[PDB]
Amino acid sequence: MLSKEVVKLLNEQINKEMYAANLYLSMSSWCYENSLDGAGAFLFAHASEESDHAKKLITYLNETDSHVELQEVKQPEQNFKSLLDVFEKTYEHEQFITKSINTLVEHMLTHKDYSTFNFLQWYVSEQHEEEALFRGIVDKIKLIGEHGNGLYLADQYIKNIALSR
Numbered sequence: 284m285l286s287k288e289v290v291k292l293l294n295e296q297i298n299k300e301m302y303a304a305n306l307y308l309s310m311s312s313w314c315y316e317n318s319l320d321g322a323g324a325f326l327f328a329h330a331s332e333e334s335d336h337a338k339k340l341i342t343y344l345n346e347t348d349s350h351v352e353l354q355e356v357k358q359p360e361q362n363f364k365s366l367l368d369v370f371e372k373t374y375e376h377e378q379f380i381t382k383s384i385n386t387l388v389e390h391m392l393t394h395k396d397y398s399t400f401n402f403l404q405w406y407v408s409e410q411h412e413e414e415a416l417f418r419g420i421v422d423k424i425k426l427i428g429e430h431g432n433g434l435y436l437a438d439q440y441i442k443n444i445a446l447s448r
Contacts, residue, residue, distance in 0.1 A: 285347050289396055292387055293340055294352045299383055300337035303376060304330045306359040310369050319366055319434070321442030326373070328445055336406070343402055366437060367424050374417040381410040420444070 285293075311326035344351050363369045384406050391400035420441060427437045 285344075285349050285399065286394065286396065288394065289391070289399055290344065290349045292390060293344060293349075293399075294354075296383060296387060297337050297340045297344075297351075298354045298356070299380065300333055300340065301353075301356050302359070303380060304334040304337065305356060306376060307333060307373065309359040309361055310363065310373065313361070313363050314366070314369065317366075319438045321438035321440075321445070322366060322369065325441050325445040326369075328448075336409075339405075343399075365429075366434060367421070367429075370417065370421050370424060374414075374421050377410070377414050377417050381414055384410055416444075 307326050307330040311323050311330060314320065314323035314326060341351055360372075363372065384403070388400065388403055388407060391397070391403065423440060424437050427433050427440070
């Protein structure tokens with residue numbers, strides 16, 4: 284079985300992931316409302332992935348005979364200023380999640396929980412992937428600009444990324 288502190292830390296991580304899902308889900312809808320259906324589809328998919336991250340943690344708890352505690356999920360932001368605003372916030376939130384993961388990994392090493400340390404390597408690896416991905420979207424949106432047919436080209440670029448996965 285796992286220590287009470289770890290279980291508390293994991294239950295906390297599960298909540299963050301559930302929140303991120305709805306946050307992304309919320310940004311997705313805003314994009315659809317502003318004709319950014321490319322970005323809309325991309326974030327809709329991403330919300331599902333984040334939701335899988337939560338279930339994977341719940342499953343680790345279920346198979347260690349640990350008690351799960353689902354807290355309330357706070358309402359997310361419903362309005363944004365633009366395509367770039369949305370993806371800056373998203374990248375921002377991803378970095379926050381990465382940080383949370385590092386703190387968890389650290390706590391496992393200091394408190395000597397090598398199993399959970401092992402199990403979490405998946406998330407370390409995964410966040411490297413997702414942080415790279417979103418950083419790229421932002422730079423890409425800036426490199427294209429809002430001038431000209433920028434928004435259009437930007438939204439189509441993101442649409443391709445969503446399809447290629």
